[PDB]
A and B are shown apart, each in its own frame.
Chain A
Amino acid sequence: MVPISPIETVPVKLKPGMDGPKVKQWPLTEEKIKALVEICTEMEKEGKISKIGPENPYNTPVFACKKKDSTKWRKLVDFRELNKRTQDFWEVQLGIPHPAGLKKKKSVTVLDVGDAYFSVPLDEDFRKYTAFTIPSINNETPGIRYQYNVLPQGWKGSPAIFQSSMTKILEPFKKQNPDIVIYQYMDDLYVGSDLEIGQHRTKIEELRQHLLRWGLTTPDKKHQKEPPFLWMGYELHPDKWTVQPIVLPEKDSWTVNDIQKLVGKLNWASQIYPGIKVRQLSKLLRGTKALTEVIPLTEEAELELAENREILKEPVHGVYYDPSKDLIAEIQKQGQGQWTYQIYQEPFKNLKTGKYARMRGAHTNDVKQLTEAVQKITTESIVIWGKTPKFKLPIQKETWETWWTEYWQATWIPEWEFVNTPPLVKLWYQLEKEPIVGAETFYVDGAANRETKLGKAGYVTNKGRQKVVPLTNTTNQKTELQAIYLALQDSGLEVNIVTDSQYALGIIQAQPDKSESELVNQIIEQLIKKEKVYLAWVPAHKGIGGNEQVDKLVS
């Protein structure tokens, strides 16, 4: 006979054709034994745990661990076998609140519900599926077995049920206090208002008693009444916010798991510290699949790590969001496919910063990557503020106009202005739209053998110029690119080039300025040196002009 809590239960079923968990216990140290017998006894008197008998043919092991800078212990059941047989839940936690999205509030209070999962009941017809024995002695007393009447910590349904139950309890209070903002993340509650400090504590006490009607306690241990508030890992001040102090490890020998933690902290730090790079550091995490393997820091990864530590020396901070002012996002190019940006409303008062250094595609250019950075910032800004910022981009209006009007795919950038801060983003060469009068016409072609990997590449021109080059360990695609490279090498500043390679033509028409292929990079270097290049395509094996002639040479 256990009392039913005021919180409405959540009906939880299991996957059909499957039963409950039946896993043997895990032999643990005697320290854990004296840290859980006192818990199952206190929760039994408080109605959070009931005792069962032999009529419950289930069992589940459970260990424990300490807490964050505290003296209390955390009981974490290992429901990994129950989760495989429990129904799937749709998570209502859609993201992480960011302090740059918080608005200015005169009074702020941060709460923390004590015994979050232990104050929300479990489904009545589901408590039987949570059985676990507790031996008092490691090899003497068989131990009386208990069950769960609340949400166990470790079950895959506990977070979703708590977040949904907490919302239903706050819904009536929020309807009675519309001007009060309540950021609800797991058990921690951020409460803000523009009321006076005196009147603010009044509504806080009203909220603490409102939650008390459902068994939710807000103890004074984690009650925050004055800044700086520790919320979501940030330091919240009345007019600014900053990330809690980030410590980067400094080992004399670096392995693989150390860099994974190093790049991780730098990604977390890049949200407010401008100019953080992790290209050369993450470049060390390629190929090697041994987490305990020492990796020496390259000269590029060492200079990259040194410049990041100097950025973290000076303390930085972000501001809060003012809906009366516009959102501005300014991007800079950091080189080597690295981009950094800042989002602000007043100049030099950054709401947050960030980086975009993703390299997608074997061949690309700075205009494509700038477009991708703008999209990443737009989606991020809609998550945090629900609107798109005005952009300040280091690209001329004429440059962008030339790119998007001529590109064959649809592409677009929202309302933006040019900011003249080098290095500017430009197109390094422009293919002609019409053949060039007076320029030598190169008919290029390349063929390779699938078996021997041997091939030829060459050209034939209208002035009688000709070349064939034998190639070893190549492909048809490589010889087609090589043939174009030969035509660019052996031509003047203006050249018409005729190929039958859809592969090669498609790469060059997208005006790439960088490539994972050394051959394409060499082609790009030649295209920049030229003054006019006209690429034309013809179908192969159709007896078309010089394409038929150069086809005989390379095949």
Chain B
Amino acid sequence: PIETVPVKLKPGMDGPKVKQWPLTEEKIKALVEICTEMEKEGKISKIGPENPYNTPVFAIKKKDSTKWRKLVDFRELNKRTQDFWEVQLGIPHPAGLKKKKSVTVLDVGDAYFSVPLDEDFRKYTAFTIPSINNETPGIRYQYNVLPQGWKGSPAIFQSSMTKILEPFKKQNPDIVIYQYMDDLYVGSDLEIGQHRTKIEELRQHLLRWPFLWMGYELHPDKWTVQPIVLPEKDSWTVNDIQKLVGKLNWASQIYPGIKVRQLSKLLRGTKALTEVIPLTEEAELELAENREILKEPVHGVYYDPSKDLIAEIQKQGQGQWTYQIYQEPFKNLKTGKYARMRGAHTNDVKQLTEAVQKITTESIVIWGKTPKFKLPIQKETWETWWTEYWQATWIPEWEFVNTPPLVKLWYQ
């Protein structure tokens, strides 16, 4: 009894045609069981080869969850309907969410299955379930309702979501609620007991209308930044000062007031790397002045809502991972460091997967966007393992880089 909101692709773009990648046995068996129930409930329908569109599908398990969740890689379809969920029916981003003491993320994607999808658009939601050893051809489906993981789903459901959350927002005017993709971000300054109590009250508001029982908690007020720091040694060698000048010279691309004159004078000649060089009176003054500039904020660095976020990650070794978020080069909106994540000292791909998920979560809370990642990994290595460790209901854009560490800029 609901009129389907008309959805159109961006002008001059066809639907997604992305090949399905091989799935493990446990994931195929999970997707066959999930899709059989969804088909019995009318959420999806089987289709034929006359539909030239296709989107990859796999399954994940969220943190501390033993239940399989279907996950569609709608990244290609999302950026082909970008004028819809950003221009027509956009969701405003609250600047106070990042200031809250506690923020709980609730999976509300199951609510989208109650709204029908535009018949003229259902063909673009096509996905294919593979078979082991290619026993049977692909089993193709398309969505009859709003699909999870499609940016158009929260946009169309937003009118429905506002009416459901209206009594709770009136009951609690201080609580900030943000919706992104299949998730609901609920932030409050209440105590941990009061917060979790108010979260359960919000769950009951949704029940009176399969992952609603979970609640991933965040604390953006505890989120830290990793600035550029300079070493502090009792004695300095030629090699130490060469690395310092190399670091400060690269850092001058960000802070224009950094000088290296008095420090380069210490290296006059052709000296051995291990020769100890005592810092002169001017070198102490110049190095002290440079340590203060690195504490001062960078001039003219602010967020532009019309520009894409970019995230670079560096593998620092020993479980250490540094990252920077920016829109323009050397205009970092945020820099951070992660240490001792899951897979530390044993699995780089799991740690990198964890780091990408953390960075994306922070970007959704702070700006309401997911950044495009520059991943320090080979394409074939990432594409072999990343789905094994993915625990999020969204997927960010990424590319693959290879930058040897000439200077340890973000972690000495």
Assess the B352–A98 pair: CB atoms within 8 A. Answer: no
Report whether A408 and B318 are in contact in the complex, using a CB–CB cutoff of 8 Å: no
The interface-forming segment of A60-68, A85-93, A254-262 is: A85-93
Q: Are B272 and A441 in contact (CB under 8 A)?
A: yes
B134: CB under 8 A from chain A?
Answer: yes
A-B contact pairs, 30 of them (CB 8 A): A10-B49, A10-B50, A89-B52, A90-B51, A90-B128, A95-B134, A182-B135, A371-B381, A375-B384, A383-B22, A385-B132, A404-B348, A408-B314, A408-B376, A410-B375, A410-B376, A410-B382, A412-B385, A438-B274, A441-B238, A462-B272, A496-B273, A506-B406, A509-B404, A536-B242, A538-B246, A542-B249, A544-B242, A545-B267, A546-B270
Indicate if A537 sits at the interface (CB-CB under 8 A): yes
Instruction: Spell out A's residues near B (CB within 8 Å).
Output: 10-13, 87-98, 101-102, 157, 160-161, 163-164, 167, 181-185, 371-372, 375, 378-379, 382-388, 404-412, 434-438, 440-441, 443, 460-462, 496, 498, 502, 505-506, 509-510, 534, 536-539, 542-546, 549
- Do the beta carbons of A92 and B381 come within 8 Å of each other? no
Q: Taking the complex as formed, is B153 at the interface, i.e. its CB lies under 8 A from any CB of chain A?
A: no
Confirm or deny: B162 has a beta carbon within 8 angstroms of a beta carbon on chain A: no
Interface residue B360 (Cβ < 8 Å from any Cβ of A): no
On B, residues with C-beta under 8 Å from A are 17, 20, 22-26, 28, 48-54, 126, 128, 130-140, 237-239, 242-243, 245-246, 249-250, 260, 264, 267-275, 314-315, 317-318, 347-352, 375-378, 380-382, 384-385, 402-407
Interface contact B318-A405, CB-CB below 8 Å:
yes
> Taking CB as reference atom, which chain A residue is nearest B242?
A538
Interface pair B238/A386, CB less than 8 Å apart: no
Q: With a CB–CB cut-off of 8 A, which chain B residues contact A379? A: 22, 384
Q: For A543, what are the chain B residues with a Cβ–Cβ distance below 8 Å?
A: 264
Which residues from B are CB-within-8-Å of A183? 133, 135-136
Query: How far is B250's CA from A225's CA once the two chains are assembled, in angstroms?
Result: 74
Extra contacts, 10 of them, besides A183-B133, A441-B273 (Cβ < 8 A), are A90-B17, A90-B54, A94-B138, A164-B140, A410-B381, A460-B270, A462-B272, A539-B249, A542-B264, A546-B269
Beta-carbon nearest neighbor of B14 in chain A: A88
**A498 contacts B273, CB within 8 Å?**
yes
A92-B128, A435-B274, A538-B245 known; A386-B24 Cβ under 8 A:
yes
Verify B317–A406 contact, CB threshold 8 A.
yes
- Bound complex: CA A182 to CA B54 (Å): 25
Q: Check if A102 sits within 8 Å of B53, measured CB to CB.
A: no
B17: chain A residues within 8 A (beta carbon):
90
How far, in whole Å, are A410 and B347 apart by their CA atoms in the complex?
Answer: 9
User: Known: A12-B50, A408-B404, A542-B260. Is A96-B274 also a contact (CB below 8 A)?
Assistant: no
Chain B hits for A387, CB < 8 A:
24-25
**With A94-B20, A386-B132 known to touch, is A409 a contact of B28 (CB < 8 Å)?**
no
In the complex, are the beta carbons of A97 and B133 less than 8 A apart?
Answer: yes
Inter-subunit contact B133/A102 (CB<8 Å): yes
> Nearest Cβ in chain A — how far from B390, in angstroms?
15
Asked whether, in the complex, the Cβ of B377 is within 8 Å of the Cβ of A546, the reply is no
Which residues of B have CB within 8 Å of A536? Answer: 239, 242-243, 273
By beta carbon, the residue of chain B nearest A380 is: B22
Inter-subunit contact A435/B381 (CB<8 Å): no
With A and B bound together, what is the CA distance between A178 and B347 in angstroms?
40
A184/B23 contact (C-beta < 8 A), A92-B128, A441-B272, A545-B242 known: no
Whether B237 and A435, one on each chain, are in contact in the complex, defined by CB atoms closer than 8 angstroms, is: yes
B317 contacts A542, C-beta separation under 8 Å: no
Bound together, the chains give a CA A91 to CA B348 distance in angstroms of 35
**CB atoms of B249 and A409 under 8 A apart:** no
Q: How far is the CA of A371 from the CA of B362 in the complex (A)?
A: 33
Given the interface pairs A90-B126, A411-B348, the reply to whether A498 lies near B274 with Cβ below 8 Å is no
Contact B352 A410 (CB under 8 A): yes
Smallest CB-CB separation from A166: which chain B residue? B137
The answer to whether B49 touches A91 (Cβ under 8 A) is yes
**Which residue of A91, A164, A461 is within 8 Å of B270 (Cβ)?**
A461
Counting from the closest, the 4 A-B pairs by CB-CB distance are A386-B25, A101-B133, A546-B270, A160-B49
Q: Tell me the complex Cα distance, A280–B381, Å.
A: 28
Instruction: State how many angstroms separate the Cβ of B140 from the closest Cβ of chain A.
Output: 7
CA distance A258 to B176 in the complex (A): 72
**A388, closest chain B residue (CB):** B24
Query: Which residue of B137, B250, B376 contacts A167 across the interface (Cβ within 8 Å)?
Result: B137
| A546 and B271 contacting across the interface, CB-CB below 8 Å | yes
Nearest Cβ on chain B to A136's Cβ, whole angstroms = 36
Query: What is the CA–CA distance of A551 and B38 in the complex, to the nearest angstrom?
Result: 70
Complex Cα gap A534–B239 (Å)? 11
Q: Are B271 and A462 in contact (CB under 8 A)?
A: yes
Closest beta carbon of chain A to B120's beta carbon, Å: 15
- Smallest CB separation, A453 vs chain B (Å): 27
Q: Is B317 a contact partner of A405 (Cβ separation < 8 A)?
A: yes
B318 and A89 contact, CB distance less than 8 A: no
Q: Residue B273 contacts which of A97, A388, A435 (CB distance < 8 angstroms)?
A: A435
Q: Which residue of B lies closest to A437 (CB)?
A: B274
